[PDB]
């Protein structure tokens, strides 16, 4: 199981779609092929779904490590606030209730004080 | 739980014209889109097939694909084109001329971006999708040429939905072009990769059913597709209508498919009788399973008494008792267990729908998965190996930009597909 | 003094479509809620109307659309009518994990409303199947959560076991292997229901040649009404379910009782009929009236619990106990000398207007723990090992992210299940 | 709260003739000025647009400006010139001949002193002013030439009122004179300085709307302006008619304009459908915002998927629920937030009017502010840099008394205006 | 024993268009003023007719033309119908300083007429919004003058807070920063109303899929009628608003209570309904019934004031207090040990003929001070700091002569507002 085609279905259509975002995503699609992980998570600031960064979270002790983008290096399971997924028919992001985070979760958001101004 | 029926080619636009003829007649709807039926069964499940517009007008959720207006001009000028919106009428000019490389690679790709935009405009209007439906021929240049480009892009977009097509197996008796086995092998090279399942439909087998079993004189393409639409709507409405064994097609996709590349089905229609034996025959559950086991009632030219059944689906319609169903299902397994695979004791899936058909008190639909499907696959490959050497009419596709080692890979995938059946035959 | 019935899957809801109609037969209850006199399955509103304590679970709306558009919908609440939107695709991993995770947040939230409404909760019962997608997956999802939340409540299941000859899906042995270890882990008592033996009861003891699932649930829930609704109703010997869990399950992992019932009289069989107490218990010892295709002659009896209805004289029961000890072909174990529990209700059993069962003065239910149950598990294991050898259908759960090593792990748990009957069967 | 619509040029006098056609038809008024409607909505808000004379005669508060009688001769001899007083018919002879320097500097100033005297005779007769309305073309020699002289003097007189014009963006397909990009650049050099806001209207974009979306054959200037008057009256009557979100244009001028020189709007009309899909389309709030986001329904030839939205106004008409409005407004922001500016989370202003239109149950009007407005500004400037070098037909304006470094300052103002969009695009 | 309602802006008048109709529902009052028996919101004339104590403020005549030409205009007086001629252009500076200065000389003159007519004035309430032009600018102009003139009266505001996701104007955060410091300076009690949370109440607890501002003001003012008109009406425990200002606001700057109300029953939900005292208060603890998009779980409760209607038994309230103390997820502060004020009115709540609310026997209003309010202010500040960084829309007030240094000055006052919840939130 893997999130990588679903993540490639996400940012190529929802987040990084844009002619100005096209040089930005070209550094990212090559980076996903280098990564050995199957489970890919996208970083967001608020519920407005603004593409911040992308993470490599796995439900085991594999790292949260920031793959590409601007964000903190380590994100703890306390730091998460809301869990995100993708709808292919909607091409938007739907809300998930609080649960054990795993492969079916596609993205997240984190705490506001964890952001720096 | 909604289904889009994207129809492609001169064949599949003619085939599905008979299909939505049945669907409007099944629910008792005026040809302009106005409901005049009286059942809540005909009222609740409209959402699956029809888009209700203002003024009780139903937009059929079905897409017509061709590179020529000519097939769609007759359907529009004829009946049941009035219920269709002009957004379903998407075409170009001119056609590919039964050419795969023109419909898939060079010229047919230009219309698909307009076609898949309508798919996105339809799927955003849909509340909940369950799977997308297609119908073409394997020798269809605009049917299968554009279609393999479609399913490759939709599976890229929608991995979670049922991706099936209704492809027509090319008959050796029915020959239009000589590069038809070229078109079939290049399709299966992508149809195994891109589709979740499909059926095996041969017109030559349907030629026998009209005359030997139904005693009909002149089988026309509408009369053939009238039987196919009885099998097309015989399967998918059981997902819609209630029953004791409500058989989802995605439930059916799990139970019938043991290996994701082994997804080829043998359809069959059970209540086949002529009007002379209408006064001679009683309609019982053992009577239909007698005709479900009948090789003459199969929609593909294969010998299931030569092959071995991987999985069997038994789609049923009518007010049936569970005792008569289960005991008759067991007795066929007691009789002909040698035509089954060894490592599964129950190779037959039962599917009873409580909602009876119109006119008939009982009806049923056979779906089988046998190892004799590779027999027609040898008919394509042996015709392919003769054509591949002498390169007859190859310069037409060579000017399109096709490579010969790409054809060998499609041949090797056909060589793989036969050998996959050989691993599970014996 | 209350409990809640739970119906998960297409199997268990179609059971509960008949059982709450059977519960309306218990007092002649109107479809709006008006009844003269009973709050154990019900909650009374201020208008004198009663709502069931029912949990209706199906991820398909179609069975839910059958319930909300039929009769007795004035009794029912949308809190009770819990529906899904996407099918489980007859899968355990989609029932337990993938599809059921978006609904269990609501379903557990609905139960905590209803358990707050209860005053003195005795427990609950779940109706489902072993080989389904919703009734095996989401049941494994739900019973895992209810055992964490409510540890000191009754955890009952009256579950349908598919026949070794009759199975409607090929993945029914492929689902039930992962289901059973999770089922044995959490449940306090679990029954098995084989419809093929029920087909034998209808064709001979009722002479019904055309039964459907509607007529099957009439006979099943009538036994369940003598099991569930009758033990609260007062008789000569009033025994509840909480004393059964001690007296029928002395084991850590032994709670698979065989539920039997053999007053089974057709409408024409009632004209030539005179049944005493011991004569019915002789028919309960018949292999045709066991409700599961098994052979009790080659099984060792751990316990024999008896539930009675109607015309019961306890002095005649003592003669019937000596009658059973006279007719011994039972192979009763030596770990308990003579533990034969009896439950007696004074009230006569009910008969549905519209069914094919005749009116009787008395009804006898019999529960038993036998060692012939593992032969039905032996049929399950041999089917699964052939599927595990060829590795057919395995991509439907590895595609869901399940492990092949977990699949043989539950087989060793299924092996550990058959070791439990071996430890009881060998030792004495 | 009254509005004067000063119409200038051969274009805007023809454009606004279609406008006051709608206004008299909106209130159900005889072509001689007699009210025959039956609503207090058509009775109370007469003061904003019409001057009631003795005997229930309504004088339209609108001024017709030209240096030729010919455009006004057809309107006066035709219908709806009879409601117009003869004081509205102010002209000279001869015309400028689409010349900016003749209409603004040498000959056109002689009539403006007579025209602005009528403005003072009208504004003293008014009870309360809210803003002054104009309409011309950017390639209008008498439309924009006299008009930039008007707005420069009225802003001197009345700084506190809404100073807007409805200028027509010159099309590269529509070529009449070669000094049309000379006339457009010299206008924007004063229109940014003197006006408060304006719209962007391109006839070439309207050519696509009539044929691709409405399926019309021969778009005439009246057929084009019939669509524009649906957007002209679609905005300003919401100031007049009551609603839950009564959107003043001066409230709209605050909410849509972040930088005082950046005041250019992208209008759009939402209920655009042909008469064939009239029986096929349901009129809902998600249906219209689907067509509000549609780039094909824009009145200016720009790509909003290339640009980024500064501010968005959503003018609505009809009995709509506040829930369906706000949730649909949020979902578009959830969908295409990449086409928005970063530093504002709510770039869409909602404007719901309770008063429904006539005939339509629901209607809406899109107003956008994107960074793609500079694209058509590059079309003028690149044509300007070619024309400025070779000095073609420059001796015509040189004899009028114009300087070349004045033209460079208008070019520098055009260069600054594009760069201001560049500062806020990315 | 009287008070005056004030309606400023397009928001508050559309509230008061429903609320005075709700006050006619309190006694079945005819549109001319004829009523059998009540002079608190009214003044009785010599002909037995009553006029409202209502202040109608809008600079646009259009909303005023809606009032003067509709029903109940025989009740209304042209002294009450105060209209303007020029719009405030959705601006704070034009409402407070530029346009509002020509009207406030009349408006303050009208109030001194009506306050002279009152005998024992309790105070007033002002209905407006936070981000408007009239309801923010002129409200800041009016409340500044009323605190100077009448220092010892009640200064209430039931104000509408725009949603962080739903805002009808971009200047709504740009107006409300300057408004709030002036609001906190003068007001005695101020509420916040988030219509997005009201939309969630209508679609689920009433199942209304198409609400407008008319249907919103039906539900809002019905709560306000239990707040305002009911506390003068006698019950088992008659408590006025003057005791609330001490017992709910012990702070110098703490007067932002969360107004909640959760008997919310649709027309079809009443058929299956039996709500006791403690069951309603559990629904009041729900995040869906808070009327403001906030999370009460992560907020610290300073106080919990309760207003009751209809069928109230005080002995059951004491069991309901122990029920709340049993169900604690409240994080109640330690500065007050157990201060839980209760108000009880015997009279049942009213139901509008034409609304979608069902008739209930009892109604429970709950007031609370929580620390999750500043998270809604955190949404306001981050929007304003982006506007202050780019300096967008700043020319609309520098053109009015406002200072950019005052804009960040009120931000530090907004920061000092969030310090007040930090001083309560950290300390215990
Ligand atoms: C007096 C009477 O009952 O006449 C029958 C009849 O006698 C026969 C000949 C019918 C008839 O079918 C044909 O003649 C036929 C010819 C070519 C291909 C397919 C059908 C019938 O048309 C078919 C029709 O079946 C239905 O109406 C089903 O609902 C069917 N619908 C259609 O076929 C249909 C017809 C016209 C327009 C739209 C649909 C259906 C089946 C499966 C799923 C959905 C719908 C029936 C009862 C009859 C006639 C009229 C003769 C048979 O078919 C069916 C589907 O029942 C052919 O084999 C059976 C044997 C029947 O005896
Ligand atoms: N006796 C009886 N058995 C039933 C009934 N309905 C279903 N079954 C049995 O249930 C089994 C099939 O399970 P399903 O109901 O299809 O599966 P499910 O648990 O509901 O879950 P899904 O597959 O996800 O829909 C078979 O053994 C059937 O005989 C019923 O009304 N009565
Ligand atoms: N619930 C509710 N909110 C309303 C109503 N009318 C307006 N609002 C809210 O008020 C806000 C808009 O404020 P406006 O009414 O336009 O502004 P104003 O304070 O009246 O002043 P001006 O801008 O000068 O007209 C939004 O948050 C609306 O949701 C109403 O009847 N009910
Ligand atoms: N049953 C049936 N087969 C058809 C029909 N039209 C064409 N075919 C078959 O389809 C094949 C030719 O492919 P087709 O799809 O029509 O060509 P395309 O237009 O290029 O897609 C041949 O095997 C034909 O016999 C039809 O109406 N009915
Ligand atoms: N839509 C529209 N455009 C017009 C009309 N008349 C002229 N134009 C456009 O206006 C421009 C010419 O300017 P115009 O105002 O007519 O010249 P003026 O009389 O000197 O003001 C060109 O772009 C024409 O296409 C008309 O009736 N309708
Ligand atoms: Mg089910
Ligand atoms: Mg206002």
Which class is domain C378-426?
mainly alpha
E14, closest residue in chain D (CA to CA): D244
**What gap in Å lies between CA D205 and CA D271, rounded to an integer?**
17
Q: Which of E343, A14, A54 is CA-nearest to residue D338?
A: A14
Note whether D248 and D264 are same-domain residues.
no
Of the three residues D236, D258, D280, the one that is the final residue of a domain is D258
DSSP annotation of E308 = E
Here the tokens at position C1 are: 């003094």
**What gap in Å lies between CA B89 and CA B62, rounded to an integer?**
10
Which class is domain E375-426?
mainly alpha
Does the N-terminal peptide bond of residue B94 adopt cis geometry, omega within 30 degrees of 0? yes
CATH for E2-234? 3.40.50.1440
Of E63, E210, E383, the CB nearest to D345: E383
Report phi then psi at C82, rounded to 5.
Answer: -100, 120
Q: 3-state class of D270 per DSSP?
A: coil
The shortest C-alpha distance from D290 to chain B (Å) reads 10
- Among protein residues, the one with the nearest Cα to ligand 5's atom 5 is D11
**What gap in Å lies between CA B287 and CA B270, rounded to an integer?**
9
Cβ pair E129, E168 in contact under 8 A:
no
The shortest C-alpha distance from B107 to chain D (Å) reads 23
Ligand 6 (ion): residues with CB under 5 Å are C 9-10, 134
Tell which one of B45, B201, B230 to mutate to probe ligand 1, the residue whose CB is within 8 A of the most ligand atoms.
B230
Strands (E) located in D215-308: 264-269
Q: 3-state class of B165 per DSSP?
A: strand
Q: 3-state class of A7 per DSSP?
A: helix
Query: CB neighbours of E270 closer than 8 A, spacing ≥ 6?
Result: E358, E359, E360
The shortest C-alpha distance from C46 to chain E (Å) reads 6
Query: CB neighbours of D417 closer than 8 A, spacing ≥ 6?
Result: D188, D192, D261, D374, D377
CATH number for the domain spanning D426: value is 1.10.287.600
Does residue C134 line the site of ligand 2, with CB under 6 A? yes
C64, closest residue in chain B (CA to CA): B242
Note whether B159 and B242 are same-domain residues.
yes
Chains touching chain A at 3 or more Cβ pairs under 8 angstroms?
A: B, C, D
Give the pocket of ligand 5 (CB within 6 Å): D 9-11, 14-15, 96, 98, 136-137, 139-143, 168, 170, 174, 176, 203, 221, 224-225
DSSP assignments along B212-245, one per residue? IIS--S---HHHHHHHHHHHHHHHHHHHHS--SS
Q: Which of C365, C369, C305, C367 is CA-nearest to residue C340?
A: C305
For residue D63, the surrounding DSSP H or E stretch is strand D62-65
- Tell me which of C79, C102, C243, C403 is the catalytic residue: C243
Question: How far is C-alpha B100 from the geometric centre of its chain's CA atoms?
Answer: 20
Does residue C132 line the site of ligand 2, with CB under 6 A? yes
**Are A88 and B160 a contacting pair at CB < 8 A?**
yes
Q: Which of B56, B53, B134 is CA-nearest to residue B87?
A: B53
**What gap in Å lies between CA D247 and CA D249, rounded to an integer?**
6
Note whether B249 and B293 are same-domain residues.
no
* Binding-site residues on chain A for chain B (CB distance < 8 A): 5-6, 9, 88-91
**Are A1 and C101 a contacting pair at CB < 8 A?**
no
Q: How many residues does chain B have?
A: 426
Cβ pair D138, D189 in contact under 8 A:
no
* D-chain residues near E218 (CB < 8 A): none
Number of structural domains in chain D: 3
Beta bridge partners of C425: none
Of D337, D339, D426, the CB nearest to A49: D337
DSSP strand pairing (D362-370 vs E362-368): unpaired
Instruction: Please list the helix, strand and coil fractions of chain B in percent, rounded to the nearest 5, in that order.
Output: 50, 20, 35
- In order of C15, C45, C227, C238, the CA distances from C232 in angstroms are 21, 21, 9, 7
Beta bridge partners of D58: D52
Here the tokens at position C152 are: 């000191």
Domain extents in chain C: 2-234, 258-374, 378-426
Q: Which of E263, E329, E266, E258 is CA-nearest to residue E290?
A: E258
DSSP assignments along C391-416, one per residue? TTTTHHHHTTT--HHHHHHHHHHHHH
- Residue C243 a catalytic site member: yes
Which class is domain E258-373?
alpha beta
CATH number for the domain spanning D267: value is 3.30.1330.20
Of B259, B321, B330, the CB nearest to C210: B321
Interface of B with D in 364-393 (CB under 8 A): none
Q: Which domain holds residue D384?
A: 373-426
Cβ pair C41, C5 in contact under 8 A:
yes
* D331 is annotated as contributing to ligand binding: no
Does residue B224 line the site of ligand 4, with CB under 6 A? yes
**What gap in Å lies between CA E104 and CA E389, rounded to an integer?**
34
**What gap in Å lies between CA E80 and CA E53, rounded to an integer?**
8
- Among protein residues, the one with the nearest Cα to ligand 1's atom 39 is B22
For residue B192, the surrounding DSSP H or E stretch is helix B180-194
- What is the torsional sign of CA D70, D76, D79, D81? positive
CATH number for the domain spanning A71: value is 3.10.20.360
Note whether D382 and D269 are same-domain residues.
no
Residue C163 neighbours by CB distance under 10 Å: 22
Q: 3-state class of D35 per DSSP?
A: strand
* D203 is annotated as contributing to ligand binding: yes
Of the three residues D258, D290, D314, the one that is the final residue of a domain is D258
**What gap in Å lies between CA A102 and CA A60, rounded to an integer?**
9
DSSP assignments along C34-75, one per residue? ------SSEEE-TTS-EEE-EEEEESSHHHHHHHHTSTTTTT
Cβ pair D109, D154 in contact under 8 A:
no
Here the tokens at position E345 are: 């009115």
- Cα dihedral E315, E320, E325, E331, rounded to 10, equals -130
- In order of D80, D110, D119, D128, the CA distances from D122 in angstroms are 20, 20, 5, 11
For residue B14, the surrounding DSSP H or E stretch is helix B9-26
Note whether B34 and B164 are same-domain residues.
yes
Fold (topology level) of C258-374: 60s Ribosomal Protein L30; Chain: A; (3.30.1330)
Number of structural domains in chain A: 1
**Are A99 and C401 a contacting pair at CB < 8 A?**
no
Note whether B76 and B199 are same-domain residues.
yes
**What gap in Å lies between CA E423 and CA E428, rounded to an integer?**
9
CATH number for the domain spanning D152: value is 3.40.50.1440
Beta bridge partners of C332: C301
**What gap in Å lies between CA D13 and CA E44, rounded to an integer?**
60
Report phi then psi at E152, rounded to 5.
Answer: -100, 35
In a domain, residue A99? The reply is yes
Here the tokens at position E76 are: 């209304």
Tell which one of C6, C9, C96, C196 to mutate to probe ligand 2, the residue whose CB is within 8 A of the most ligand atoms.
C9
Of the three residues D258, D274, D303, the one that is the final residue of a domain is D258
* E-chain residues near C46 (CB < 8 A): 273-274
Note whether D389 and D363 are same-domain residues.
no
Here the tokens at position E354 are: 């034409």
d(CA D195, ligand 7 centre) in Å: 26
Residue from C105, C107, C398 whose CB has the most chain A CBs within 10 Å, to mutate: C105
Both ends of chain D: CA-CA distance in Å? 39
Q: Which domain holds residue A104?
A: 4-110
**Are A89 and B159 a contacting pair at CB < 8 A?**
no
The number of the ligand nearest the C-alpha atom of D74 reads 5
- What is the torsional sign of CA C126, C128, C130, C133? negative
* D-chain residues near B55 (CB < 8 A): 279
Here the tokens at position C21 are: 């109609």
Interface of D with B in 268-297 (CB under 8 A): 276-277, 279-283
Note whether B426 and B331 are same-domain residues.
no
The shortest C-alpha distance from D398 to chain A (Å) reads 44
Using the structure block, give the residue that is written with the tokens 């998927």. D305
Cβ burial A33-59 (10 Å sphere, 16+ → b, else e): eeeebebbbbbbbeeebebbbbbbbbe
- In order of B73, B390, E424, the CA distances from B69 in angstroms are 6, 35, 75
Cβ pair D288, D271 in contact under 8 A:
yes
Beta bridge partners of E305: E367
Here the tokens at position B388 are: 């591949």
**What gap in Å lies between CA B198 and CA B140, rounded to an integer?**
16
DSSP annotation of D29 = B
Instruction: Please list the helix, strand and coil fractions of chain E in percent, rounded to the nearest 5, in that order.
Output: 45, 15, 40
**What gap in Å lies between CA B365 and CA B367, rounded to an integer?**
7
Three-state secondary structure readout of D177-213: CCCHHHHHHHHHHHHHHHCCEEECEEHHHHHHHHHHH
Q: How many residues does chain E have?
A: 428
Question: How far is C-alpha B124 from the geometric centre of its chain's CA atoms?
Answer: 25
Using the structure block, give the residue that is written with the tokens 């337990």. C96
Q: Which of D421, A115, C386, D370 is CA-nearest to residue B344?
A: C386
In a domain, residue A115? The reply is no
Here the tokens at position A17 are: 């779609």
Here the tokens at position C86 are: 């996407």
Q: CA-based diameter of chain D, in Å?
A: 63
**What gap in Å lies between CA E237 and CA E242, rounded to an integer?**
15
**What gap in Å lies between CA E85 and CA E232, rounded to an integer?**
37
The shortest C-alpha distance from C66 to chain A (Å) reads 28
Tell which one of B49, B206, B237, B359 to mutate to probe ligand 1, the residue whose CB is within 8 A of the most ligand atoms.
B359
Does the N-terminal peptide bond of residue D94 adopt cis geometry, omega within 30 degrees of 0? yes
**What gap in Å lies between CA B318 and CA C413, rounded to an integer?**
42
Using the structure block, give the residue that is written with the tokens 């019915």. C280
Cβ pair E342, E317 in contact under 8 A:
yes
Beta bridge partners of B135: B7, B166
Alpha helices by DSSP H, listed for D216-321, are 221-240, 249-256, 285-292
């Amino acid at each position: 199981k893997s999130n990588k085609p679903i993540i490639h279905n996400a940012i190529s259509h929802c987040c990084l779609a844009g002619k100005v975002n096209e040089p930005h995503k070209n550094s990212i699609l090559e980076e996903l092929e280098k990564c050995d992980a199957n489970h890919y998570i996208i970083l967001f600031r608020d519920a407005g779904c603004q593409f911040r960064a992308l993470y490599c979270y796995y439900p085991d002790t594999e790292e949260i490590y920031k793959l590409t983008g601007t964000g903190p290096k380590n994100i703890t399971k306390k730091m998460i606030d809301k869990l995100y997924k993708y709808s292919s028919d909607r091409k938007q992001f739907n809300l998930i209730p609080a649960k054990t985070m795993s492969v079916s979760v596609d993205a997240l958001t984190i705490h506001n004080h964890l952001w720096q101004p | 739980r909604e289904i889009v029926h994207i129809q492609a080619g001169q064949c599949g636009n003619q085939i599905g014209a008979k299909f939505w003829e049945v669907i409007s007649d099944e629910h008792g709807i005026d040809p302009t889109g106005s409901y005049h039926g009286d059942s809540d069964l005909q009222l609740e499940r409209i959402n699956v097939y029809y888009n209700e517009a203002a003024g009780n007008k139903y937009v059929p959720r079905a897409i017509l694909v061709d590179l020529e207006p000519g097939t769609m001009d007759s359907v529009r000028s004829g009946p049941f084109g009035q219920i269709f919106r002009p957004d379903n009428f998407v075409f170009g000019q001119s056609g590919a001329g039964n050419n795969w490389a023109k419909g898939h690679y060079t010229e047919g790709a230009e219309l698909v971006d307009s076609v898949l935009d309508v798919v996105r405009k339809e799927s955003e209007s849909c509340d909940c999708l369950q799977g997308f439906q297609l119908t073409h021929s394997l020798g269809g240049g605009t049917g299968s040429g554009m279609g393999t480009l479609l399913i490759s892009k939709i599976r890229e977009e929608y991995p979670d939905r049922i991706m099936n097509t209704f492809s027509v197996v090319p008959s050796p008796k029915v020959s239009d072009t000589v590069v038809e086995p070229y078109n079939a092998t290049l399709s299966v090279h992508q149809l195994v990769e891109n589709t979740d399942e499909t059926y095996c439909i041969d017109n030559e087998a349907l030629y026998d059913i009209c005359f030997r079993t139904l005693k009909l004189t002149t089988p026309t393409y509408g009369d053939l597709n009238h039987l196919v639409s009885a099998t097309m709507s015989g399967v998918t409405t059981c997902l819609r209508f209630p029953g004791q064994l409500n058989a989802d097609l995605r439930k059916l996709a799990v139970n019938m498919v043991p290996f994701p590349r082994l997804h080829f089905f043998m359809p069959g229609f059970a209540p086949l009788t002529s009007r002379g034996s209408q006064q001679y025959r009683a309609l019982t559950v053992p009577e239909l399973t007698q005709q479900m086991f009948d090789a003459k009632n199969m929609m593909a030219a294969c010998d299931p008494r030569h092959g071995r059944y991987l999985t069997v689906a038994a789609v049923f319609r009518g007010r049936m008792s569970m005792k008569e169903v289960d005991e008759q299902m067991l007795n066929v397994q007691n009789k002909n267990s040698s035509y089954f695979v060894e490592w599964i004791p129950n190779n037959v899936k039962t599917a009873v729908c409580d909602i009876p058909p119109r006119g008939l008190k009982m009806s049923a639909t056979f779906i089988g998965n046998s190892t004799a499907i590779q027999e027609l696959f040898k008919r394509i490959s042996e015709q392919f190996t003769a054509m591949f050497r002498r390169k007859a009419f190859l310069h037409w596709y060579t000017g399109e930009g096709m490579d010969e080692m790409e054809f060998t890979e499609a041949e090797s995938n056909m060589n793989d597909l036969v050998s996959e059946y050989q691993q599970y035959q014996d | 003094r209350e409990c809640i019935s739970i119906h998960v899957g297409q199997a268990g809801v179609q059971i509960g479509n008949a059982c709450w109609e059977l519960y309306c037969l218990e007092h002649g209850i109107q479809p709006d809620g008006q009844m003269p006199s009973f709050n154990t399955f019900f909650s009374e509103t201020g208008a004198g109307k009663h709502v069931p304590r029912a949990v209706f679970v199906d991820l398909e709306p179609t069975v839910i659309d059958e319930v909300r558009t039929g009769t007795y919908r004035q009794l029912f609440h949308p809190e009770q009518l819990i529906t899904g939107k996407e099918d489980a695709a007859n899968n355990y991993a989609r029932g337990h994990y993938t599809i059921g995770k978006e609904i269990i947040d609501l379903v557990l939230d609905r139960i905590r409303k209803l358990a707050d409404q209860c005053t003195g909760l005795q427990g609950f019962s779940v109706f489902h199947s072993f080989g389904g997608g919703t009734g095996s997956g989401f049941t494994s999802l739900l019973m895992e959560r209810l055992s964490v939340d409510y540890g000191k409540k009754s955890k009952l299941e009256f579950s349908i076991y598919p026949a070794p000859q009759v199975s409607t899906a090929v993945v029914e042995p492929y689902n039930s292997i992962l289901t059973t270890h999770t089922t044995l882990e959490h449940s306090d008592c679990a029954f098995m229901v084989d419809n093929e033996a029920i087909y034998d009861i209808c064709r001979r003891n009722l002479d019904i040649e055309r039964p459907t699932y509607t007529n099957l649930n009439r006979l099943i829930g009538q036994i369940v009404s003598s099991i569930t609704a009758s033990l609260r109703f007062d008789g000569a010997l009033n025994v509840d379910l909480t004393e059964f869990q001690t007296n029928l399950v002395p084991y850590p992992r032994g709670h698979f009782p065989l539920a039997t019932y053999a007053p089974v009289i057709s409408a024409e069989k009632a004209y030539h009929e005179q049944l005493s107490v011991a004569e019915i218990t002789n028919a309960c010892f018949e292999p045709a009236n066991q409700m599961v295709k098994c052979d009790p002659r080659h099984g060792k009896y751990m316990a024999c619990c008896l539930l009675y209805r109607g015309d019961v004289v306890p002095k005649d029961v003592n003669a019937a106990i000596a009658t059973i000890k006279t007719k011994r072909t039972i192979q009763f174990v030596d770990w308990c000398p003579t533990g034969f529990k009896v439950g007696i209700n004074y009230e006569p059993p009910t008969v549905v207007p519209g069914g094919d069962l005749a009116k009787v003065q008395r009804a006898v239910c019999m529960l038993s723990n036998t060692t012939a149950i593992a032969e039905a598990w032996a049929r399950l294991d041999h089917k699964f090992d052939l599927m595990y050898a060829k590795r057919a259908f395995v991509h439907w759960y590895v595609g869901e992210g399940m492990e092949e090593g977990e699949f043989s792990e539950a087989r060793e748990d299924m092996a550990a299940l058959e070791k439990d009957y071996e430890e009881v069967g060998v030792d004495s």
